[PDB]
A and B are shown apart, each in its own frame.
Chain A
Amino acid sequence: VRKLKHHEQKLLKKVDFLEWKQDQGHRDTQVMRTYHIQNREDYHKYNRICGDIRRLANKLSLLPPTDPFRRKHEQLLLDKLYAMGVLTTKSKISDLENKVTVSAICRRRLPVIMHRLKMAETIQDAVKFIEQGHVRVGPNLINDPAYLVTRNMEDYVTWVDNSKIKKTLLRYRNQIDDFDFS
């Protein structure tokens, strides 16, 4: 579309082919670009899970404050989300509405975990290294980039053995032992 003239813009104020109100600012596309999300529906599945969390938090808030049921369930939810890694802290109840985002879940995906662990320089590099078969979480090889890492499961995200990446880093430090297969 060419640039509208002045008299045309007044008659065509609402016209926009690229930004619609139902797009919600292309927040989904922004988040997928930040965390290299490949599947299109991943943001919306994550958003539905966040919506369940926020709906439950709203109901617990509408419960009376000095309710043992309310306090127990809010602490249960805070502990569960913190253990998964979605919540950075357990201090505030209000984080169950303010700090539950899609990006918070996407920061627990495997390439973001590797990039934070300095295993890969970019999230896209981490994605490619995952699909190329270099990454194991424990004994198990993970070639799915969408795999979500728990706080406990962070400690076993490591390079697979016989990896050219692992041999390269050992050879850089001059600590490569070929008996160990490197």
Chain B
Amino acid sequence: FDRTAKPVPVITSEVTESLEDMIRRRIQDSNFDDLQRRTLALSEELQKAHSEISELYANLVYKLDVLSSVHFVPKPARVETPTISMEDAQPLYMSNASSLAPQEI
């Protein structure tokens, strides 16, 4: 009589040995199907084309942000120095120490 499906294969000594020899060979070859971690000079005419496209892209993404953005959309835009120079122009100051750390000096 005809059987409808192949029976479930039994695990025997030769099957186990073949499996273990495959595992041994792949360990020796270091072949491992592992999941790998995903991370994280042009010319002058090409540079001019890139600069023009960068400016156009900046303006376009500004206008699209104005359309879809929940808040107000701003327009798209360390040497040794005293911090009192880094402040804004007004009679007072609040911080005195120079910008560079001792480890940076």
Contacts and interface: CB of A to CB of B under 8 A. Distances in A.
B64 A80 contact: yes
Interface stretch (B55-63, B81-89, B90-98): B55-63
Contacts of A150: 68
A73 interface: yes
A76 B53 CA distance: 13
Contacts, number: 38
Contact of A60 (B53, B59, B61, B68): B53
A80 B63 CA distance: 12
A84 interface: yes
A53 interface: yes
Main secondary structure of the interface of B (DSSP, over half): helix
Interface string A47-74: 0010011011001101100000100010
Contacts of A60: 53
B105 to A, nearest CB: 39
B67 interface: yes
B67 A80 contact: no
Contact-residue size bin, chain B (C-beta under 8 Å from the other chain):
10 to 19
A49 B63 contact: yes
Interface string B14-31: 000000000000000000
Contact of B50 (A49, A55, A69): A69
A148 B67 contact: yes
Contact of B67 (A49, A69, A73): A49
A84 B68 CA distance: 7
A77 interface: yes
Interface of A: 49, 52-53, 55-56, 59-60, 62-63, 69, 73, 76-77, 80-81, 84, 148, 150
